[PDB]
Design a binder for this molecule. Structure first.
Ligand SMILES: O=c1ccn([C@@H]2O[C@H](COP(=O)(O)OP(=O)(O)O)[C@@H](O)[C@H]2O)c(=O)[nH]1
Ligand SMILES: O=c1ccn([C@@H]2O[C@H](COP(=O)(O)OP(=O)(O)O)[C@@H](O)[C@H]2O)c(=O)[nH]1
Ligand SMILES: [Pt+2]
Ligand SMILES: [Pt+2]
Lengths: 239, 239
C-alpha cells in the first residue's frame, strides 16, 4: 500500500512539497510515491528529491517514478491504475494538504473510492482516489478515453463518465467530504453561511481546487496553505 | 401511498398551486395531501381548494389536512412522519415543481430517503423526502428537537443531526440530485460552467430554494417557474 501524488509541471513543485510535509506531520504509516511526467524538467525533480531527503527514514520512504504524459497531459493521473506492484493506492492531488492522519483510508475494502464533488453533489471529485491497481482496468480507461466526453473538460469529468453509477455504490466507495474538502465551497459559503463549512467534521484533507493555486498568489484557507509550506521549508532546510 | 406538500403561510399559496399543477401534468398515479398549518387563514385554504377542484377526478384525489404548527413553525414539516394512515409518503416542498413523473420514488424499499444538498454534498436537503410514517419515530423527532441544534437553523439542519449517517446509507435512501435539483447550484455555475448543471440527468424535480421565491419577484429557471404557474391558472380557470 502507498500514498501517491502527481506532478506534471515544474510550477506545482511547491504543492508537492506542502503535501509531502503534511503527510510527514500526520505520521502516515505507508510510503509515498511521487509520479512525475515528462514535462517536469530534471532539475525540478532533483530539487524535489533534495527537499524530501530530510524526511526519509528507516520507517518512511518517499520514492520517485517517471511516468509518460497522457493527453486528450490531462489524463496523466490514470497511471495510478497501472501501479500494480501495490495492492492499494491512496492518490492525492498535489494541490491538497493532509491535516490529520488518513491511514484508515486503506481499511476500505473496495477497488475504487472517491469523495463527492460539490457540483453536482452526486458526482465525485477526482482529487482523492482510493484504488486497487489493475493493468486491465488501466488498458480500458486508456481505450475509453478516446470515446467518452467529460462534462468538466478534465479527468474528473472523464472518470465520472467511466463510473456513472458511483453515487449508487456502497459506503466503502463513497468517501465523506472531509477526505476531499474543496475550498470552492468555503469560498462560496464563508461570508454568508460559515456553519455549512464547520459541519464538515472531521476535516482531514483540504483540497485547493480551482484557481489561482495558493503558490500562484490571501484568504483564511490560503493562509493555512502558506503556514504548511513555509514550515516545510524550515524543517527541510534547518531541521 | 401519497404525495404530500405543506403550506404554513398564505404567501406560499402560489408555490402550492404551481406544484399541484405540475403533479397533474406529470400524471402521477398517487393522490396528494396538502398539509396546511394554523397560520394559513381559511380564505387562502378555500381559494386553494377552489384552484384544485378542476384537477379532481375519479382517478386522482387532492385532499387537505389541517396540522398544528411546530416551532423551535420551522419544524411543521415533521408532521409527515405521523401521517400513518399511509404506508409511504413522497413529500415535496411547496417551492418545487415536478417536471417529469416521479411515481418510481414509491418503489424504493426504505423508510427514509432524501437527496444530497450541495453544501456540504454529504448531507441531505430536506425539500424532497420519501418516508414511511411511524408515530413512534415522530414522537422521538418531537423530543429530540428540544436537544439537537441545526447547522443551518432549519429543518434540514435538524434532520441531518437526527440522521447523521445518511451519506453511509444504501442507495435506496440516497436519491439522485435530479430528484431535488436546487436552483442555488444553477445560480452559481450557469454563467461560468453550465455543463455542471446539464450533467444532472434526468432532471425530474426542480427546487426553488433560497430567496427570493419566484412568486416574491427573472432568470431562466424563474421563467420556467412562471411558465408552470401561469399555465396552471389558465387550466384552472378556463380549462
Ligand atoms: O499544471 C498542472 C496541472 C495538474 N497537475 C497535477 O494534476 C493534479 C490535478 O490538477 P488540478 O489539481 O490543478 O485540478 P483541479 O483540482 O483544480 O480541478 C494536480 O493537483 C497535480 O497533481 C500538475 O502537476 N500541474
Ligand atoms: O414561509 C413559509 C416557509 C415555509 N413554508 C413551507 O415549508 C417549506 C420549506 O421552506 P422553504 O422551501 O422556503 O425553505 P428552503 O427550501 O429555501 O430552505 C416550503 O417549501 C413550504 O412548503 C411555507 O409554506 N411558508
Ligand atoms: Pt486539485
Ligand atoms: Pt424549499
Amino acid at each position: 500500500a502507498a500514498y501517491a501524488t502527481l506532478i506534471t509541471s515544474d510550477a506545482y513543485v511547491m504543492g508537492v512539497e506542502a503535501l509531502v510535509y503534511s503527510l510527514f506531520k500526520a505520521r502516515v504509516a505507508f510510503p509515498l510515491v511521487v509520479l512525475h511526467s515528462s514535462q517536469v524538467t530534471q532539475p525540478t525533480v532533483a530539487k524535489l528529491t533534495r527537499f524530501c531527503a530530510p524526511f526519509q527514514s528507516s520507517t518512511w520512504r518517499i520514492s520517485f517514478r517517471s511516468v509518460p504524459d497522457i493527453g486528450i497531459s490531462g489524463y496523466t493521473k490514470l497511471h495510478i491504475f497501472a501501479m500494480d506492484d501495490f495492492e492499494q493506492i491512496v492518490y492525492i492531488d498535489a494541490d491538497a494538504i493532509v491535516l490529520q492522519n488518513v491511514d484508515e483510508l486503506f481499511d476500505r475494502s473496495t477497488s475504487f473510492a472517491a469523495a463527492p464533488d460539490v457540483f453536482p453533489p452526486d458526482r465525485f471529485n477526482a482529487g482523492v482516489l482510493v484504488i486497487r491497481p489493475n493493468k486491465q482496468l488501466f488498458a480500458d480507461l486508456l481505450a475509453k478515453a478516446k470515446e467518452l466526453k467529460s462534462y468538466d473538460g478534465g479527468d474528473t469529468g472523464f472518470l465520472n463518465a467511466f463510473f456513472p453509477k458511483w453515487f449508487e455504490s456502497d459506503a466503502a466507495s463513497r468517501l465523506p467530504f472531509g477526505y476531499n474538502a474543496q475550498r470552492t465551497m468555503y469560498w462560496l459559503v464563508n461570508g454568508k453561511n460559515p456553519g455549512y463549512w464547520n459541519a464538515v467534521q472531521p476535516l482531514k484533507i483540504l483540497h485547493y481546487s480551482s484557481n489561482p493555486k495558493p503558490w500562484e498568489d490571501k484568504g483564511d484557507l490560503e493562509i493555512l496553505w502558506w503556514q504548511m509550506y513555509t514550515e516545510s521549508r524550515c524543517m527541510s532546510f534547518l531541521g
